[PDB]
Assembly symmetry: D2
């Protein structure tokens, strides 16, 4: 038998190692409330409150800011606008899988498209695991992969750190 | 029914979330040679050649610098002297599991003990995954956990990136 | 009398503290050659070779890549295209002052305009100082100002560390 | 004839470029009160309240936590005990110069000695400048000098950002 843990389900075009950039971040925290974490990740109106690299949001076809399957929305991060659509949403009692495709309105070498996935789950003895991974395609993604320091890595780490702090 | 990936086997005292600091890094790379990666991770004399934060090493009871089960050694990283011993070593055709316990010769609140694990494996379509995770205990671990940027996260990311570059 | 050092001359519009973001980085290095540093900063063809956050460059009306007063150009950084124009260029035997205004082609809340200045000078006993400061205006600059970690600060530090490494 | 700004007075043994690590950080903020900044920097009991990376403080010969010339004290940063002594203190109506030498209780290769200087000053049009620079000697300083992201640079920027936010 194998020693394994739950992993993200990637659509074929976003498989890590098959795109231009891949970033992975993960925290495992004792005493963290699963439901609060889920709530603070899904309801996008909280992001600006705990993750300072993000700003305004807009849900185009909803009267609330809660992400569910197929939610079409936009948000600001690192000062620029990201258009997005939820492509995966499955919430069970001990695990949440949530992922959105993101893109900008640029053309040619400035176009950037991404698939940002999340997996939140309860583990033994009152621990919560938050895994977030992003696969990116386009010329700017090639530049981000070479950046020093790794801006995406630190940015996503700050998202995780803020979500944890805000959920206690 | 579950979607999972191979995961590190933690001894009980080191379980993520039960210690003072947990860091997790991962890369997934297309066309990377699995045997070269294994060679450059196992032979510690290569570390200083591709990972700038590592320094001198010494194997106390071996006439070579190749890590295997129970290897007792020391090395410098981030200017700190780490005493270590390999506590896990399992190498197969498609996967390597390697981990060492590390500690310093300090006492009281200056003491720091860590368990640094690695999982290298071949994935489908000519991809190699390198997962490294570290669990730390002691007062100095509590200070590292608060760093922003996260010092260990960026260090380990650089170790991974160097290991990849060096193995092409 | 005062103890002072040479400082950047700012147009009124860009005065630090009067805009939306201000970034300051500085290195002072022993045994570094002034002329070589100026060459590697002014000749933008070197940027990509030592500063990994920068990509392709283009001079619109020069048959070379040497920045001089009023040089109009564009360069890629953090994956985005920056249009620019040199607004200050004064090179003496022991001090260089160089600055450009930069902007993107975006509209509304995505529009960003910056003034990035540099001061390279010889100091007593074979040391060279490299000071770089940038003032930014626009809604994205307000976001960059609160970013965690500070993206601009770390990127510019990488520019300086690279310039130094490449000039040694 | 020269365009200059006030600069820190370094004792000879700490001159930037002549030691193992030099870090420079600076903010310039509109509407910040000079006296408030001076208060929140000199009264080391506020450090904990606005800068999360600093720990306990202790004053060896004073019944108060206000730093002045020759003030002997110790503090914790990065989970490290640093014995310090103020070696510079000059407070005028529009400029403060404050600096301390710090050291640890270690021998040979683990020994670290630093000189951390500050310059707070009023600038034209209701702006306040806060400049902080640190020069470090010893083997651990050599390691810090190689960190990417630069650990000292990011910690000091956080100190400055906290100081500003708290004094607003």
């Amino acid at each position: 038998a194998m020693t394994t843990m739950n992993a993200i389900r990637w659509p074929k075009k976003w498989i890590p190692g098959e795109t231009d950039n891949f970033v992975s971040n993960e925290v495992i925290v004792k005493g963290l409330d699963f439901n609060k974490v889920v709530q603070h990740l899904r309801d996008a109106s909280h992001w600006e409150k705990y993750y300072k690299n993000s700003g305004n949001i807009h849900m185009y076809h909803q009267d609330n800011t809660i992400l569910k399957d197929k939610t079409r929305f936009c948000f600001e991060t690192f000062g620029f606008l990201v258009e997005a659509e939820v492509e995966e949403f499955e919430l069970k009692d001990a695990i949440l899988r949530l992922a959105w495709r993101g893109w900008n309105e640029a053309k040619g070498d400035e176009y950037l498209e991404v698939y940002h996935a999340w997996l939140v789950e309860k583990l033994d003895n009152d621990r919560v695991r938050i895994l977030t991974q992003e696969s990116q395609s386009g010329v700017p993604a090639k530049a981000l992969a070479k950046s020093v320091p790794n801006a995406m890595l630190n940015g996503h780490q700050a998202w995780l750190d803020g979500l944890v702090a805000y959920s206690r």
